Design a protein around this nucleic acid. Structure first.
Ligand SMILES: Cc1cn([C@H]2C[C@H](O)[C@@H](COP(=O)(O)OP(=O)(O)OP(=O)(O)O)O2)c(=O)[nH]c1=O
Ligand SMILES: [Ca+2]
Ligand SMILES: [Ca+2]
Ligand SMILES: [Ca+2]
Ligand SMILES: [Ca+2]
Ligand SMILES: [Ca+2]
Length: 900
DNA sequence: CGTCGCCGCCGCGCGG
DNA sequence: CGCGCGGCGGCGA
């Protein structure tokens, strides 16, 4: 096979590399790598190395990496550019793997672990590590086994061995309901003392050294606790055995609030799953406990136990160990679904970076670009110092707040990357500048043509048309990958809707799910078989369809994020190719493109309908437009349609056959105007929205910029079995809004758009009556706990203290002097509740860590003093009044003459 | 060390 | 609750 690296590190003058050899075996080597850097030379000397501007360079080969680094410093002291890859391990990887990397995931050791630490005196601080580690479950991807290390004797209690038999039994049998599919995969090892446990762990770690190290909060907890506990018991050199090269560093993350010291293990790539999940999942959650994320992702119940966790080992060691094992598997199950590890490996190997660098698009793009340029013997520029400067972004149209019955949206495919490709925006393609007219002049096509030679953006920039820049070239490759995966995703989604439809008539039989590839549209043959299947098989197929969809979503949306990050990186000072001329060229062009097509769509539809000056485009944001279709529907007449799907077909056909061709012509004209290198402004129909035929639903409404709701029947070619609410910006979409409130506000909107004013009034009235029965968690707001110490004055709110910080301070006073109460962690999420006047907490609100029940100490008092009225007024009624007034509806029935 | 736009809540200090 | 301004949180692109 083709060799591929596992991990790479620079230690002084040595590259330490772990890799898979041609035989598929893990090896390690130390290389005294001689790096090269470059300096400009006279045009009058022979060379094959040139910078991106075509200036000739001479290669400087160094005896070792430290010499190379010192040369950089001397070049700074002289005042001359030191060119080339100054991250010597990226140069090493480029030299060693001078080909597209084919990796075999089965050869890569992915370790998933978690630890248990019994602690009576509060949260066990990793940097102190003063309490015994009493359980480690370490899953190994290569062995496919859960290795369980269990402490039997501790200063906090001596316990019996864990029973695998009881762990397999149902909870109703007194068991732990450890899923049957992993029972045979548990290798259980009890220990009489913590020393032997840790020594055996390290020996085990030596035999099965993780390449990818993951788990839940392992970077902030498990890793530093294990390292520090071992350091406390045995000394540093023994702790350093967690690194295959025996080197570690104790380092902080730079922020703007506080600091936390994490452990860098040289020769391992740590990908904490919480960090994988936060970057790649495209959610914001009220809580990031594994219980919460597991319930959300997998619909599994919370791990249930009595008393505090600090007493669990003592009271019920059986369950303690089982819940440790189950916690590991749940991360595996989340990954099986989301596929973030797979995504990380893909991106990592593509860029030829340390895998853990996927968290950093700047590092990723820096390495992609460097490899692309090196292939052509081109030399990258030195990174420079730049002051942070604000620059303009997208255009957003101000909508007229109103109901909107029929709506068709259109959206530009991958806007910013396509602008980069169309215009040819790249560091080395800058051709010069032209004299800019006000942007509206370009929008209305009244400004003089920018250039007859070069490709232009209305910010004044000009670019070469003779050849593609490295940015367009490299961004196009990832874009194409993205497109493929989006194709798989949408097809899985369409297939899902076919299964949903079929589920309306399940056939009563014993049968199996069809063996199909969900990434491809179901054939007619498959459709007919599905029409003959039982609910059991259809539901299992739907589950499989939805899993394929999720897999496709992960692959596509994060490649989208990566290509969009290239456009953003051009506006970040740490990017090697930082250039505000290029970042602004993208965004200004975007503002022109949007407003230009607004004009064209308006001009086109006015002609179709025989009017003048009327606005059809009601809204737009960045690259999408929302077109009112009322008049199109009205021109045929609502009476003429058989059912909802019929007018949906009609709008789909009208958008695909009349509007899209007009949109294309309008954009082809803009391309010529700007003299761009390649027409790539592709604006397709996205949504078809409206109320059900014959109903009193309003279809959609806008309250303002980035705030609207639509009743969608068709989204980029996916015809839904049941209409789906597209809601943006409104309170239903915010992680800060109470759960039950999100739910009720969503149902109010559903009723408004699908059913009408009377249905909405019927629901509101019922919610208002029953609201006081809602569980306190379901009605708590959520916020992030930032800068607590800034607003802490003696335990009481300082000047300008935010509401939620006030709540935290109230909580702190209430729990003061209590070792075992959950402390609020700076930066993490809190639930927030209003408190009625004259409560014992001595303030108007209280906040506690999210995802958890509030400590039993103050729960009863919180539940008794919760201010439901404030809750109902602030989180529900005020948002609802905002919706309804915008939609010109009343949520409460107004009095009429009929009341006699 | 991808970006900007822009919403609503809140504290504050008004606003004769 | 009448109002904007700045801080904040949190999405929407
Ligand atoms: C989502 C997102 C968009 N944008 C900008 C760049 C996008 O091109 C532009 C439009 O956003 P989107 O329409 O959400 O995304 P897109 O056009 O790039 O991709 P798609 O084909 O799925 O429509 O807004 C960002 O800068 N960062 C982001 O995270
Ligand atoms: Ca635990
Ligand atoms: Ca788009
Ligand atoms: Ca599209
Ligand atoms: Ca059937
Ligand atoms: Ca869009």
């Amino acid at each position: 096979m083709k060799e591929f690296y596992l991990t790479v590190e620079q230690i002084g003058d040595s590259i330490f590399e772990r890799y898979i050899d041609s035989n598929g075996r893990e090896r390690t080597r130390e290389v005294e790598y001689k790096p090269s850097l470059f300096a400009h030379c006279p045009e009058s000397q022979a060379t094959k190395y040139f910078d991106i501007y075509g200036k000739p360079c001479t290669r400087k080969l160094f005896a070792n990496m430290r010499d190379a680094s010192q040369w950089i410093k001397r070049m700074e002291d002289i005042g001359l550019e030191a060119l080339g890859m100054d991250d010597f391990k990226l140069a090493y990887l480029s030299d060693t793997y001078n080909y597209e990397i084919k990796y075999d995931h089965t050869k890569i050791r992915v370790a998933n672990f978690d630890i248990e630490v019994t602690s009576p005196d509060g949260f066990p601080e990793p940097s102190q590590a003063k309490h015994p580690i009493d359980a480690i479950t370490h899953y190994d991807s290569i062995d496919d086994r859960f290795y369980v290390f269990d402490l039997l004797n501790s200063p906090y209690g001596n316990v019996e061995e864990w029973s695998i038999e009881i762990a397999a039994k149902l909870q109703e049998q007194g068991g732990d309901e450890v899923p049957s599919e992993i029972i045979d995969k548990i290798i259980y090892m009890p220990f009489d003392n913590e020393k032997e446990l840790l020594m055996e762990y390290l020996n085990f770690w030596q035999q099965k050294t993780p390449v990818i190290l993951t788990g839940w909060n392992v970077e902030s907890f498990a890793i530093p606790y294990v390292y520090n506990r071992i350091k406390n018991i045995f000394g540093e050199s023994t702790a350093k055995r967690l690194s295959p090269h025996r080197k570690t560093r104790v380092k902080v993350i730079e922020n703007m609030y506080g600091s936390r010291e994490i452990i860098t293990l040289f020769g391992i790539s740590v990908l904490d799953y919480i960090d994988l999940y936060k970057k790649f999942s495209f959610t914001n959650q009220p809580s990031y406990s594994l219980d919460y994320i597991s319930e959300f992702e997998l619909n599994v119940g919370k791990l249930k136990y009595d008393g505090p966790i600090s007493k669990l080992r003592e009271s019920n060691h059986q369950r303690y160990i089982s819940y440790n094992i189950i916690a590991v598997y749940r991360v595996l199950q989340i990954d099986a679904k989301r596929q973030f590890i797979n995504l990380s490996l893909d991106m990592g190997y593509y860029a030829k970076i340390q895998i853990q660098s996927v968290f950093s698009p700047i590092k990723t793009w820096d390495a992609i670009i460097f490899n692309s340029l090196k292939e052509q013997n081109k030399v990258i520029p030195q990174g420079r110092s730049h002051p942070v400067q604000p620059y303009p972004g997208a255009f957003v149209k101000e909508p007229i707040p109103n109901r909107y019955k029929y709506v068709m949206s259109f959206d530009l495919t991958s806007l910013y990357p396509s602008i980069i490709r169309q215009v040819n925006i790249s560091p080395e393609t800058i051709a010069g500048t032209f004299k800019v007219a006000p942007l509206h002049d370009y929008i209305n096509a009244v400004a003089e043509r920018p250039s007859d030679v070069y490709s232009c953006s209305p910010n004044g920039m000009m670019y070469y048309k003779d050849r593609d820049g490295v940015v367009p070239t490299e961004i196009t490759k990832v874009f194409n990958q993205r497109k493929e995966h989006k194709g798989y995703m949408l097809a899985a989604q369409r297939n899902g809707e076919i299964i949903k439809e079929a589920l309306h008539n399940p056939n009563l039989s014993v049968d199996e799910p069809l063996d199909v590839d969900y990434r491809f549209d179901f054939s007619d043959e498959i459709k007919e078989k599905i029409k003959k299947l039982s609910a059991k098989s259809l539901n299992e197929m739907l589950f499989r369809a939805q899993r394929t969809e999720v897999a496709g979503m992960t692959a596509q949306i994060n490649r989208k994020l990566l290509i969009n990050s290239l456009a953003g990186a051009l506006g970040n000072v740490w990017f090697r190719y930082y250039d505000l001329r290029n970042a602004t060229a993208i965004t200004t062009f975007g503002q022109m493109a949007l407003q230009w097509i607004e004009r064209k769509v308006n001009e086109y539809l006015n002609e179709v309908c025989g009017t003048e000056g009327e606005a059809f485009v009601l809204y737009g944001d960045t690259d999408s437009i929302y077109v009112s279709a009322d008049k199109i529907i009205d021109k045929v007449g609502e009476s003429k349609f058989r059912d909802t799907n019929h007018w949906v077909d009609f709008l789909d056909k009208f958008a695909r056959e009349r509007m899209e061709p007009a949109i294309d012509r309008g954009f082809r004209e803009m391309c010529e105007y700007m003299n761009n290198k390649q027409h790539l402004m592709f604006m397709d129909r996205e949504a078809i929205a409206g109320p059900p035929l014959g109903s009193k639903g309003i279809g959609g409404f806008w309250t303002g910029k980035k705030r609207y709701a639509l009743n969608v029947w068709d989204m980029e070619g996916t015809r839904y079995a049941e209409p789906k609410l597209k809601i943006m910006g409104l309170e239903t979409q915010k992680s800060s809004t109470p759960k039950a409130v999100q739910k009720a506000l969503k149902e109010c909107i559903r009723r408004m758009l699908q059913e009408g004013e009377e249905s909405l009034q019927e629901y509101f009235k019922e919610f208002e009556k029953e609201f006081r029965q809602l569980n306190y968690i379901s009605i708590a707001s959520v916020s992030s706990a930032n800068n607590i110490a800034k607003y802490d004055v003696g335990g009481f709110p300082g000047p300008k203290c935010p509401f939620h910080i006030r709540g935290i301070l109230t909580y702190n006073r209430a729990i003061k002097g209590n070792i075992d109460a959950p402390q609020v962690v700076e930066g993490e999420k809190v639930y927030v509740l209003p408190l009625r006047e004259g409560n014992p907490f001595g303030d108007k609100c209280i906040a506690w860590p999210s995802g958890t029940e509030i400590t039993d100490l103050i729960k009863d008092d919180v539940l008794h003093w919760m201010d439901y009225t404030v809750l109902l007024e602030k989180t529900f009624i005020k948002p609802l009044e905002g919706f309804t007034s915008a939609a010109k509806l009343d949520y409460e029935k107004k009095a009429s003459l009929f009341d006699m």
